Short mmCIF file of N, CA and C and ligand atoms in Angstrom, two decimals:
data_model
loop_
_atom_site.label_atom_id
_atom_site.label_comp_id
_atom_site.label_asym_id
_atom_site.label_seq_id
_atom_site.Cartn_x
_atom_site.Cartn_y
_atom_site.Cartn_z
N UNK W 113 28.69 25.46 -4.61
CA UNK W 113 28.43 24.41 -5.01
C UNK W 113 27.09 24.97 -6.53
N UNK W 114 27.21 26.08 -6.89
CA UNK W 114 26.70 26.68 -8.25
C UNK W 114 26.50 28.08 -8.49
N UNK W 115 25.63 28.73 -9.09
CA UNK W 115 25.52 29.74 -9.17
C UNK W 115 23.89 30.32 -9.33
N UNK W 116 23.70 31.45 -8.41
CA UNK W 116 21.98 32.02 -8.15
C UNK W 116 22.41 33.33 -8.16
N UNK W 117 20.99 34.04 -8.68
CA UNK W 117 20.85 35.60 -8.50
C UNK W 117 19.52 35.59 -7.74
N UNK W 118 19.33 36.47 -6.77
CA UNK W 118 18.17 36.91 -6.26
C UNK W 118 17.25 38.09 -6.57
N UNK W 119 15.77 37.53 -7.05
CA UNK W 119 15.17 38.97 -7.06
C UNK W 119 14.01 39.22 -6.14
N UNK W 120 14.12 40.56 -5.58
CA UNK W 120 13.16 40.79 -4.87
C UNK W 120 11.98 41.82 -5.49
N UNK W 121 10.79 41.26 -4.94
CA UNK W 121 9.58 41.98 -5.26
C UNK W 121 8.92 42.81 -4.06
N UNK W 122 9.21 44.17 -3.95
CA UNK W 122 8.56 44.45 -2.57
C UNK W 122 7.14 45.32 -2.71
N UNK W 123 6.41 44.25 -2.14
CA UNK W 123 5.13 44.72 -2.02
C UNK W 123 4.42 45.60 -0.56
N UNK W 124 5.58 45.48 0.33
CA UNK W 124 5.14 46.49 1.53
C UNK W 124 4.84 47.71 1.47
N UNK W 125 3.95 48.48 2.66
CA UNK W 125 3.70 49.74 2.97
C UNK W 125 4.99 50.49 3.69
N UNK W 126 5.43 51.71 3.82
CA UNK W 126 6.36 52.10 4.62
C UNK W 126 5.68 52.43 6.02
N UNK W 127 4.60 52.45 6.20
CA UNK W 127 4.12 52.38 7.37
C UNK W 127 4.30 51.60 8.20
N UNK W 128 4.31 51.58 9.56
CA UNK W 128 4.63 50.37 10.58
C UNK W 128 3.31 49.55 10.46
N UNK W 129 3.80 48.27 10.47
CA UNK W 129 2.70 47.14 10.48
C UNK W 129 3.17 46.16 11.17
N UNK W 130 2.16 45.37 11.09
CA UNK W 130 2.67 43.97 12.25
C UNK W 130 3.47 42.96 11.31
N UNK W 131 3.32 42.89 9.91
CA UNK W 131 3.81 41.96 9.24
C UNK W 131 4.84 42.58 7.98
N UNK W 132 5.95 41.96 7.89
CA UNK W 132 6.74 42.10 6.68
C UNK W 132 6.66 41.00 5.54
N UNK W 133 6.24 41.35 4.35
CA UNK W 133 6.17 40.74 3.32
C UNK W 133 7.52 40.45 2.39
N UNK W 134 7.88 39.34 2.02
CA UNK W 134 8.83 38.86 0.97
C UNK W 134 8.45 38.37 0.13
N UNK W 135 8.67 38.74 -1.33
CA UNK W 135 8.35 38.11 -2.35
C UNK W 135 9.34 37.77 -3.27
N UNK W 136 10.34 36.50 -3.07
CA UNK W 136 11.46 36.56 -3.87
C UNK W 136 11.32 35.40 -4.83
N UNK W 137 12.27 35.89 -5.83
CA UNK W 137 12.40 34.76 -6.86
C UNK W 137 14.02 34.41 -7.15
N UNK W 138 14.43 33.38 -6.87
CA UNK W 138 15.89 33.06 -7.10
C UNK W 138 15.98 32.22 -8.39
N UNK W 139 17.09 32.47 -9.25
CA UNK W 139 16.98 31.79 -10.50
C UNK W 139 18.49 31.24 -10.41
N UNK W 140 18.53 29.82 -10.90
CA UNK W 140 19.79 29.24 -11.09
C UNK W 140 20.34 29.99 -12.69
N UNK W 141 21.71 30.52 -12.11
CA UNK W 141 22.46 31.18 -12.99
C UNK W 141 23.64 30.71 -13.70
N UNK W 142 23.79 29.32 -13.04
CA UNK W 142 25.29 28.76 -13.33
C UNK W 142 25.04 27.71 -14.36
N UNK W 143 25.92 26.79 -14.14
CA UNK W 143 25.87 25.59 -15.05
C UNK W 143 25.36 24.21 -14.49
N UNK W 144 25.53 24.28 -13.19
CA UNK W 144 25.31 23.18 -12.51
C UNK W 144 23.68 23.21 -12.08
N UNK W 145 22.84 21.72 -11.74
CA UNK W 145 21.99 21.81 -11.19
C UNK W 145 21.94 22.21 -9.72
N UNK W 146 21.17 22.75 -9.16
CA UNK W 146 21.13 22.96 -7.52
C UNK W 146 19.69 22.44 -7.00
N UNK W 147 20.31 21.64 -5.87
CA UNK W 147 19.02 21.00 -5.28
C UNK W 147 18.50 22.12 -4.25
N UNK W 148 17.32 22.59 -4.14
CA UNK W 148 16.84 23.58 -3.47
C UNK W 148 16.96 23.33 -1.80
N UNK W 149 17.03 21.87 -1.54
CA UNK W 149 17.41 21.70 0.01
C UNK W 149 18.79 22.40 0.46
N UNK W 150 19.38 22.78 -0.72
CA UNK W 150 21.00 23.00 -0.22
C UNK W 150 21.09 24.67 -0.30
N UNK W 151 19.94 25.63 -0.51
CA UNK W 151 19.76 26.59 -0.68
C UNK W 151 19.30 27.60 0.53
N UNK W 152 19.84 28.08 0.98
CA UNK W 152 19.60 29.04 2.18
C UNK W 152 19.26 31.01 1.54
N UNK W 153 18.29 31.76 1.87
CA UNK W 153 18.50 33.22 1.70
C UNK W 153 18.16 33.61 3.22
N UNK W 154 18.81 35.06 3.56
CA UNK W 154 18.95 35.70 4.58
C UNK W 154 18.23 37.25 4.36
N UNK W 155 17.19 37.62 5.12
CA UNK W 155 16.67 39.09 4.67
C UNK W 155 16.90 39.37 6.40
N UNK W 156 17.70 40.85 6.47
CA UNK W 156 18.19 41.31 7.50
C UNK W 156 17.37 42.52 7.93
N UNK W 157 17.23 42.79 9.30
CA UNK W 157 16.45 43.75 9.76
C UNK W 157 16.65 44.04 11.09
N UNK W 158 15.89 45.34 11.49
CA UNK W 158 15.79 45.49 13.11
C UNK W 158 14.47 45.43 13.35
N UNK W 159 14.47 44.23 14.50
CA UNK W 159 13.37 43.97 15.04
C UNK W 159 12.45 44.93 15.56
N UNK W 160 13.14 45.90 16.07
CA UNK W 160 12.28 47.04 16.73
C UNK W 160 11.63 47.21 17.92
N UNK W 161 10.97 46.15 18.24
CA UNK W 161 10.51 45.68 19.56
C UNK W 161 10.87 43.88 19.55
N UNK W 162 11.22 43.65 20.89
CA UNK W 162 11.48 42.14 21.05
C UNK W 162 10.25 41.52 21.16
N UNK W 163 10.28 40.24 20.46
CA UNK W 163 9.00 39.49 20.55
C UNK W 163 9.35 38.04 19.88
N UNK W 164 8.76 37.07 20.20
CA UNK W 164 9.06 35.83 19.81
C UNK W 164 8.38 36.34 17.90
N UNK W 165 9.02 35.65 17.09
CA UNK W 165 8.43 35.70 15.72
C UNK W 165 7.93 34.62 15.13
N UNK W 166 7.04 34.54 14.08
CA UNK W 166 6.47 33.64 13.22
C UNK W 166 6.50 33.83 11.91
N UNK W 167 7.31 32.65 11.12
CA UNK W 167 7.16 32.76 9.52
C UNK W 167 5.98 32.11 9.03
N UNK W 168 5.54 32.66 7.71
CA UNK W 168 4.76 31.94 7.06
C UNK W 168 5.04 31.99 5.69
N UNK W 169 5.07 30.74 4.89
CA UNK W 169 5.08 30.79 3.20
C UNK W 169 3.75 30.55 2.92
N UNK W 170 3.03 31.79 2.22
CA UNK W 170 1.74 31.74 1.65
C UNK W 170 1.57 30.85 0.52
N UNK W 171 2.67 30.92 -0.60
CA UNK W 171 3.01 30.38 -1.78
C UNK W 171 4.26 30.20 -2.19
N UNK W 172 4.48 28.99 -2.93
CA UNK W 172 5.68 28.84 -3.54
C UNK W 172 5.49 28.08 -4.85
N UNK W 173 6.13 28.36 -5.77
CA UNK W 173 6.27 27.53 -7.26
C UNK W 173 6.57 26.09 -6.73
N UNK W 174 6.91 25.70 -5.65
CA UNK W 174 7.52 24.24 -5.21
C UNK W 174 6.60 23.85 -4.10
N UNK W 175 5.60 24.87 -3.66
CA UNK W 175 4.82 24.29 -2.60
C UNK W 175 5.16 24.79 -1.57
N UNK W 176 4.22 25.51 -0.78
CA UNK W 176 4.43 26.71 0.20
C UNK W 176 5.06 25.82 1.45
N UNK W 177 4.58 24.58 1.49
CA UNK W 177 4.99 23.65 2.78
C UNK W 177 6.38 23.15 2.61
N UNK W 178 6.99 23.49 1.24
CA UNK W 178 8.38 23.26 1.12
C UNK W 178 9.36 24.10 1.72
N UNK W 179 8.68 25.29 1.99
CA UNK W 179 9.71 26.36 2.21
C UNK W 179 9.82 26.59 3.96
N UNK W 180 10.76 26.71 4.28
CA UNK W 180 11.38 26.78 5.70
C UNK W 180 11.62 27.97 5.90
N UNK W 181 11.29 28.47 7.14
CA UNK W 181 11.68 29.80 7.91
C UNK W 181 12.45 29.69 9.29
N UNK W 182 13.62 30.29 9.46
CA UNK W 182 13.85 30.42 11.14
C UNK W 182 14.67 31.85 11.08
N UNK W 183 15.05 32.00 12.36
CA UNK W 183 15.76 33.23 12.62
C UNK W 183 16.77 33.13 13.34
N UNK W 184 17.68 34.05 13.22
CA UNK W 184 19.01 34.37 13.96
C UNK W 184 19.26 35.86 14.19
N UNK W 185 20.24 36.09 14.97
CA UNK W 185 20.45 37.39 15.59
C UNK W 185 21.85 37.60 14.65
N UNK W 186 21.87 39.18 14.35
CA UNK W 186 23.29 39.54 14.10
C UNK W 186 23.80 40.20 15.13
N UNK W 187 25.16 39.55 15.48
CA UNK W 187 26.02 40.01 16.60
C UNK W 187 27.36 39.94 16.34
N UNK W 188 28.14 41.18 16.73
CA UNK W 188 27.63 42.31 16.97
C UNK W 188 26.28 42.85 15.70
N UNK W 189 25.47 43.61 16.22
CA UNK W 189 24.60 44.21 15.49
C UNK W 189 25.42 45.13 14.51
N UNK W 190 24.55 45.14 13.61
CA UNK W 190 25.12 46.11 12.63
C UNK W 190 23.80 47.27 12.20
N UNK W 191 23.97 48.25 11.24
CA UNK W 191 23.02 48.97 10.68
C UNK W 191 22.22 48.35 10.31
N UNK W 192 20.81 48.34 10.71
CA UNK W 192 19.89 48.02 9.82
C UNK W 192 19.58 46.63 10.06
N UNK W 193 20.38 45.79 10.85
CA UNK W 193 20.32 44.45 10.88
C UNK W 193 20.79 44.08 12.50
N UNK W 194 19.76 43.67 13.02
CA UNK W 194 19.90 43.04 14.47
C UNK W 194 19.46 41.72 14.34
N UNK W 195 18.92 41.44 13.13
CA UNK W 195 17.93 39.72 13.16
C UNK W 195 17.84 39.63 11.40
N UNK W 196 17.89 38.24 11.52
CA UNK W 196 17.57 37.86 10.18
C UNK W 196 16.50 36.95 10.37
N UNK W 197 15.74 36.71 9.05
CA UNK W 197 15.14 35.40 8.71
C UNK W 197 15.72 34.72 7.67
N UNK W 198 15.93 33.51 8.08
CA UNK W 198 16.63 32.68 6.97
C UNK W 198 15.40 31.87 6.02
N UNK W 199 15.33 31.73 4.97
CA UNK W 199 14.21 31.04 4.26
C UNK W 199 15.04 29.79 3.37
N UNK W 200 14.61 28.64 3.76
CA UNK W 200 15.19 27.48 3.24
C UNK W 200 14.07 26.54 2.71
N UNK W 201 14.39 25.28 2.29
CA UNK W 201 13.68 24.39 1.75
C UNK W 201 13.73 22.96 1.80
N UNK W 202 12.81 22.20 1.93
CA UNK W 202 12.59 21.19 2.56
C UNK W 202 13.84 20.07 1.54
N UNK W 203 13.77 18.82 1.56
CA UNK W 203 14.63 17.56 1.03
C UNK W 203 13.75 17.46 -0.42
N UNK W 204 12.17 17.32 -0.28
CA UNK W 204 11.21 17.27 -1.24
C UNK W 204 10.98 18.39 -2.35
N UNK W 205 11.75 19.67 -1.97
CA UNK W 205 11.40 20.76 -2.77
C UNK W 205 11.87 20.58 -4.23
N UNK W 206 12.83 19.92 -4.24
CA UNK W 206 13.28 19.46 -5.69
C UNK W 206 14.46 20.13 -6.44
N UNK W 207 14.72 19.94 -7.50
CA UNK W 207 15.76 20.89 -8.41
C UNK W 207 15.85 21.95 -9.26
N UNK W 208 16.83 22.88 -9.36
CA UNK W 208 16.76 23.81 -10.52
C UNK W 208 17.33 23.50 -11.20
N UNK W 209 17.04 23.17 -12.56
CA UNK W 209 17.89 23.34 -13.54
C UNK W 209 18.62 24.49 -13.98
N UNK W 210 19.98 24.87 -14.37
CA UNK W 210 20.25 26.05 -14.87
C UNK W 210 19.21 26.96 -15.89
N UNK W 211 18.74 28.10 -15.56
CA UNK W 211 17.68 28.61 -16.27
C UNK W 211 16.12 28.54 -15.60
N UNK W 212 16.26 27.82 -14.64
CA UNK W 212 15.10 27.65 -13.80
C UNK W 212 14.99 28.67 -12.56
N UNK W 213 13.71 28.90 -11.92
CA UNK W 213 13.76 29.59 -10.95
C UNK W 213 13.05 29.04 -9.83
N UNK W 214 12.90 29.57 -8.55
CA UNK W 214 12.04 29.27 -7.50
C UNK W 214 11.22 30.59 -7.18
N UNK W 215 9.83 30.65 -6.93
CA UNK W 215 9.39 31.85 -6.35
C UNK W 215 8.75 31.46 -4.99
N UNK W 216 8.70 32.35 -4.48
CA UNK W 216 8.01 32.06 -3.07
C UNK W 216 7.51 33.76 -2.55
N UNK W 217 6.03 33.65 -1.72
CA UNK W 217 5.52 34.77 -1.21
C UNK W 217 5.67 34.28 0.15
N UNK W 218 6.56 35.09 1.22
CA UNK W 218 6.21 34.55 2.40
C UNK W 218 6.15 35.95 3.31
N UNK W 219 6.40 35.80 4.58
CA UNK W 219 5.95 36.96 5.83
C UNK W 219 6.54 36.50 7.15
N UNK W 220 6.70 37.82 7.72
CA UNK W 220 6.76 37.18 9.31
C UNK W 220 6.19 38.04 10.14
N UNK W 221 6.23 38.18 11.22
CA UNK W 221 5.36 39.01 12.15
C UNK W 221 5.72 38.54 13.75
N UNK W 222 5.62 39.64 14.38
CA UNK W 222 6.03 39.16 15.86
C UNK W 222 4.37 38.70 16.78
N UNK W 223 4.59 37.59 17.23
CA UNK W 223 3.56 37.20 17.98
C UNK W 223 2.59 37.90 18.91
N UNK W 224 3.57 38.83 19.50
CA UNK W 224 2.93 39.75 20.58
C UNK W 224 2.04 40.90 19.99
N UNK W 225 2.03 40.86 18.44
CA UNK W 225 1.21 41.61 17.62
C UNK W 225 1.86 43.29 17.54
N UNK W 226 2.86 43.36 18.20
CA UNK W 226 3.65 44.52 17.93
C UNK W 226 4.23 44.87 16.39
N UNK W 227 4.55 46.13 16.41
CA UNK W 227 4.52 46.56 14.71
C UNK W 227 6.03 46.66 14.54
N UNK W 228 6.53 46.45 13.33
CA UNK W 228 7.85 46.78 12.79
C UNK W 228 7.77 48.29 12.01
N UNK W 229 8.95 48.76 12.03
CA UNK W 229 9.32 50.10 11.31
C UNK W 229 10.25 49.34 10.36
N UNK W 230 9.88 49.19 9.03
CA UNK W 230 10.56 48.77 7.89
C UNK W 230 11.46 49.56 7.18
N UNK W 231 11.51 50.82 7.21
CA UNK W 231 12.05 51.59 6.33
C UNK W 231 13.64 51.80 6.72
N UNK W 232 13.95 51.19 7.98
CA UNK W 232 15.54 51.09 8.56
C UNK W 232 16.07 49.80 8.21
N UNK W 233 15.58 49.01 7.70
CA UNK W 233 15.99 47.61 7.64
C UNK W 233 16.87 47.45 6.55
N UNK W 234 17.93 46.53 6.57
CA UNK W 234 19.03 46.62 5.72
C UNK W 234 18.80 46.11 4.59
N UNK W 235 17.83 44.98 4.42
CA UNK W 235 17.32 44.24 3.42
C UNK W 235 16.03 45.18 2.60
N UNK W 236 15.41 46.11 3.17
CA UNK W 236 14.31 46.57 2.73
C UNK W 236 14.62 47.74 1.62
N UNK W 237 14.27 47.35 0.17
CA UNK W 237 14.48 48.17 -0.92
C UNK W 237 13.51 49.51 -0.94
N UNK W 238 13.61 50.17 -2.01
CA UNK W 238 12.55 51.24 -2.11
C UNK W 238 12.17 51.32 -3.90
N UNK W 239 12.07 50.16 -4.13
CA UNK W 239 11.80 49.67 -5.56
C UNK W 239 10.25 49.01 -5.34
N UNK W 240 9.13 49.52 -5.74
CA UNK W 240 7.98 48.83 -5.03
C UNK W 240 7.38 48.21 -6.40
N UNK W 241 6.77 46.98 -6.28
CA UNK W 241 5.98 46.46 -7.14
C UNK W 241 6.61 45.81 -8.49
N UNK W 242 7.91 45.97 -8.41
CA UNK W 242 8.56 45.31 -9.53
C UNK W 242 9.77 44.43 -8.79
N UNK W 243 9.93 43.19 -9.71
CA UNK W 243 10.78 42.39 -9.37
C UNK W 243 12.39 43.18 -9.93
N UNK W 244 13.35 43.23 -8.92
CA UNK W 244 14.76 43.61 -9.20
C UNK W 244 15.49 42.73 -8.80
N UNK W 245 16.90 42.47 -9.38
CA UNK W 245 17.99 42.08 -8.77
C UNK W 245 18.37 42.62 -7.09
N UNK W 246 18.51 41.97 -6.41
CA UNK W 246 18.40 42.64 -5.00
C UNK W 246 19.69 42.25 -4.28
N UNK W 247 20.81 42.97 -4.16
CA UNK W 247 22.16 42.29 -3.21
C UNK W 247 22.22 42.33 -1.91
N UNK W 248 21.00 42.59 -1.06
CA UNK W 248 20.72 42.79 0.33
C UNK W 248 19.96 42.02 0.64
N UNK W 249 19.65 40.78 0.21
CA UNK W 249 19.28 39.42 0.72
C UNK W 249 20.31 38.34 0.16
N UNK W 250 21.11 37.67 1.05
CA UNK W 250 22.29 36.81 0.68
C UNK W 250 21.55 35.39 0.42
N UNK W 251 22.27 34.99 -0.40
CA UNK W 251 21.96 33.39 -1.14
C UNK W 251 23.13 32.52 -0.83
N UNK W 252 22.94 31.31 -0.11
CA UNK W 252 24.06 30.21 0.09
C UNK W 252 23.74 28.91 -0.28
N UNK W 253 24.47 28.28 -0.88
CA UNK W 253 24.30 27.01 -1.32
C UNK W 253 25.19 26.04 -0.46
N UNK W 254 24.60 25.24 0.09
CA UNK W 254 25.78 24.44 1.14
C UNK W 254 26.28 25.18 1.88
N UNK W 255 25.93 26.41 2.50
CA UNK W 255 26.76 27.01 3.11
C UNK W 255 27.50 28.21 2.91
N UNK W 256 27.76 27.97 1.52
CA UNK W 256 28.56 28.79 0.97
C UNK W 256 27.69 29.97 0.16
N UNK W 257 28.18 31.44 0.40
CA UNK W 257 27.86 32.58 0.08
C UNK W 257 27.74 32.70 -1.75
N UNK W 258 26.59 32.70 -2.11
CA UNK W 258 26.66 32.63 -3.65
C UNK W 258 26.22 33.99 -4.33
N UNK W 259 25.31 34.72 -3.42
CA UNK W 259 24.88 35.83 -4.27
C UNK W 259 24.70 36.88 -2.84
N UNK W 260 25.13 38.21 -2.96
CA UNK W 260 24.49 39.46 -2.13
C UNK W 260 25.82 39.75 -1.31
N UNK W 261 25.78 40.75 -0.34
CA UNK W 261 26.53 41.43 0.57
C UNK W 261 25.66 41.14 2.12
N UNK W 262 26.79 40.41 2.84
CA UNK W 262 26.19 40.58 4.09
C UNK W 262 26.61 41.79 5.00
N UNK W 263 25.53 42.08 5.98
CA UNK W 263 25.80 43.42 6.67
C UNK W 263 26.93 43.41 7.59
CA1 CA Y 534 13.01 47.45 11.53
#
């Protein structure tokens, strides 16, 4: 359904924390317009202790309330990946023309307030404070894998 690239800006600490932050910029690198409602991203990790989780988007270029989050299990589990968060967009989020990008700042946490070990997560990188192309967050358009490497 088109072409995209995912850039990730890691502002997390290595220390165990109750929150994992995700700052993501997705650029339309193809020749076709993209409706953001068709775009899903997945960030894969080990949950570390079992708890209900909550997703929040604090800011997006298309409006924080137009960003959705949900969770899934990786089964059978893989190295660094027993869980993922899937970030999506509402019907009202709009289009990206070729060359345009969407940016969002989001996070997730465990509602029992237990901590994550981030360092072992499949999608966690080691490049801090700089947006880089990051192939361990996958992107799908209309269900079709367009960017990245599934665990
Ligand atoms: Ca973990």
